[model samples]
Target chain A: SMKLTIPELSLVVLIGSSGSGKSTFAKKHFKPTEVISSDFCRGLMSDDENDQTVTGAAFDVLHYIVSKRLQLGKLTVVDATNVQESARKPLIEMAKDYHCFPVAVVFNLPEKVCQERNKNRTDRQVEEYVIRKHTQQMKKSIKGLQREGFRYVYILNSPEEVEEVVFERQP
Target chain B: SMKLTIPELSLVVLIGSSGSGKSTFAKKHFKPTEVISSDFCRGLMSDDENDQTVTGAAFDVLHYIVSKRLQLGKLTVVDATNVQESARKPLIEMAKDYHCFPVAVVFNLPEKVCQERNKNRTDRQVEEYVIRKHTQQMKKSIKGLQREGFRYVYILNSPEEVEEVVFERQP
Candidate 1:
């Protein structure tokens, strides 16, 4: 449990699979309004939280909220499956446009953990392999997070690390 | 070398994994218009065919089109992974409603076939375990298809059978 300091004005990008402990960690560290979820954005656009067809619309809302929060110099936590390049590229750009640094909070959990945790989700009846693929994408991108304009990348490999994360924000 | 016979007015429901040659079999056996697919329905409702959240609505469109074809006294083939109880249950009811029979045309190919084929598809993107689970469900249901209101059950175990399938129809 090392003391971790995050810049208060930074746009925090939490990247992980469905059961990667991203949501719980964000809830512990940030205010509810500071964290905006892609699933919630999906629901806002398409009335159904799992409706992935509205991904474009969902991210539009996510970017809109993020930009608005950044303009006010607020720390914004993006809670989503940021496993794909398309999702993360825009966030990197958003941080630059807002003149604020980007921070990557990555939950790089074991593949089995995601499978075991998502297996119990009733909504994920047939998408178990999807989580596996997500981690594959995550692993490939883990090394590149810093190169993509993120000032700092914090990787938590286990739930223990997630629990041990002590937040120290600087002005 | 298996010969599959169908009554002139029947609904053929294909049961298998995504890459099990269901589409190849359907195209060879029947007219393109005479066959409808759940993925095709998924595309109709949503712009993208791979979006699975529209499954309920996709099947709704598939069944509606099938019932229409049945009312016209035409034989229709459904090209889909008819592996779930929820997906198969309504087909049984639809057969009874239209006074037509439901035939099970199963493609029980080797697990590798699905993985290999789906790997080549831009949409599937390596969800190979999904095929393993699909075949597991197919194995469980292959024996009970008759009890599930299917009048004729035809299973093609490999690519040879997919290519060699001779559809023998009767009055």
Candidate 2:
């Protein structure tokens, strides 16, 4: 039997390209209330899931909620495509404010896999160009994320690696 | 202008009789999200303000939320008719969890004043014997509350005293 170990309390950030299953992984591992999603925040403010105009405001709300949860010594997961430096920096700062270790879970799924997943989606009809752009950005940032001051970084590079990732709650 | 000093980033328990204006004081002094009322929790779970059957569960949820908020470094107020020892133990435990001062805002109104105010209310009516019994128990218990590990106890003996209480957020 494989055993999974998690910190007593920590802030976990899930980073990936579009359609890389960040939300899916978060939903499976974290309690709904414990995971803060920028998409959900955007939907909350604008009533549209695809409203990217309020991205900045959504991140602000997301960080605020995350900071609050962390301060209470609660384990929190940020569910977002945090491939960009700007997006990841604020989440790192939030973890620091609560004095909790920030762990990055990078979903390094291949571009072809993501595009195939996107094509079958009935809700979000993202173009191939958009998917390709995100995949390129994610690949470009993966090497630099090690310098981002995260206490630990776990990069799951393949579908098998994603399935092998296990989450354990600490008492 | 008279300034009343409140402990910054602390869990405050507002203790009073039914009509001692604990809720009013909480509203005036704390942010809406920063005050957790047992009645509000009861209403949340049972949709009834006077559902004593859910009191145990209601406080469990209330304390859970309160503890979460406090961990985020938000100052919070517990609004309840905490005229008994049992109602206050969980809050004390929560304060210990945060390592922050537990300040009790004791609304020690006269028994006659509480009785007069209770007569004008449309909420649950209790026998005078019950009220008197609890009041007597509270009066006897109030002096020993500090021994229960509360950092400080602020007894507001008059309406004027309650009105004078003020709080300031850290700059």
Candidate 3:
């Protein structure tokens, strides 16, 4: 087992596509207070977490909370599909400014797993093409995560590791 | 109003001379379970936390306990006067091995504060020169702490910050 250790006071950004199990992994490992999700923020702004039109407004709230939490030296897990370096640049910058480590937990599972999983979801359903696009972005960005200033990168390549990973709310 | 944030899964090494109030500061800022103090470990093996001769065995147990705690993703604060790089190197290495952050909480108070405080200690009385040497080492090592793999070096340069300061734990 490759132990994924996030420094006690670090910024954890969950990188995955829809149905890649970001929410499940977040809830399994972090307290409800610790996981500040983009979907939650999206729902807050537009009454639909899947509302792509509200990305700007959703991230505004997400960044605000993340910044405040880092200032207090609180550990935070961003429950979002951060499939790009541009998406993570500002978050890494926040960690640098506050003198904290940036950690990336990537749920880079097979595309079929995500597609099959999302197929059964009751909420907003993501198309297979969308999942492929996001996972492709995650794939292309894998090597760049370290260079993007994510001091630690924890990637779960299989479904079992993604689902079976259980740990406390703090770490 | 200073915010001292040691991320959730961090090894916080308290480096200061005896009577630098590392214990008091630790108790104030950490859960009783979270602070795995070396002095307490020392007393467990030899009935005297200050018995210099028992350093090897006491530290053996201390290191074991620290390893266990970090494996469980617990935040551990070491209460010891780590005035030397040799003492700190192993602890930082442990953090690295466990994939966690190593933090230094340095009590760089006036030499007089430690001397005055240690004079009243019921358990052990440290010589004045020892405290001076510790303070001297701590002073000299301030710049190099980061270089030594202590990702964060928190310096309480005054006795006020050590004995008088307090904050909510886990921030």
Cα lDDT of all candidates, in order?
0.79, 0.74, 0.78
Worst ten in a row by lDDT for model 1 chain A: A40-49
Clashing pairs in 2: A71-B71, A72-B71
Clashes of 3: 5
Candidate 2 docking: what grade?
incorrect
Q: Which pairs of residues clash in candidate 3, taking residues 3 or more apart in a chain or in different chains?
A: A8-B7, A8-B8, A8-B9, A9-B7, A9-B8
Residue lDDT tens for model 1, B1-171 = 667788888988999987887887788888776788876656544554465565665566577656655655667888989988778888888888888889998887888878888888865553667888998888788888888889888887778878888988865
**C-alpha DockQ of every model:** 0.01, 0.04, 0.01
Which residue runs does candidate 1 get wrong by more than 4 Å? Answer: A122-126, B1-171
> What value of lDDT does candidate 1 attain over all alpha carbons?
0.79
- The alpha-carbon RMSD over the true interface for every model, in angstroms, is 17.2, 9.9, 20.8
The alpha-carbon root-mean-square deviation between model 2 and the true structure, to one decimal in Å, is: 11.7
> Per-residue lDDT for A1-171 in model 3, tens only?
446766778889999888988888888777776787888656534433577875776687677657766775667788888897878999999999998889988888988889999989987787689999998998888888888899988788898787666533334
TM-score, one value per model? 0.49, 0.51, 0.48
* Stretch of 10 with least lDDT, candidate 2 chain A: A40-49
Runs with alpha carbons beyond 4 Å of true place in candidate 3: A164-171, B1-171
The stretch of ten residues in a row with the least summed lDDT in candidate 1 chain B is B43-52
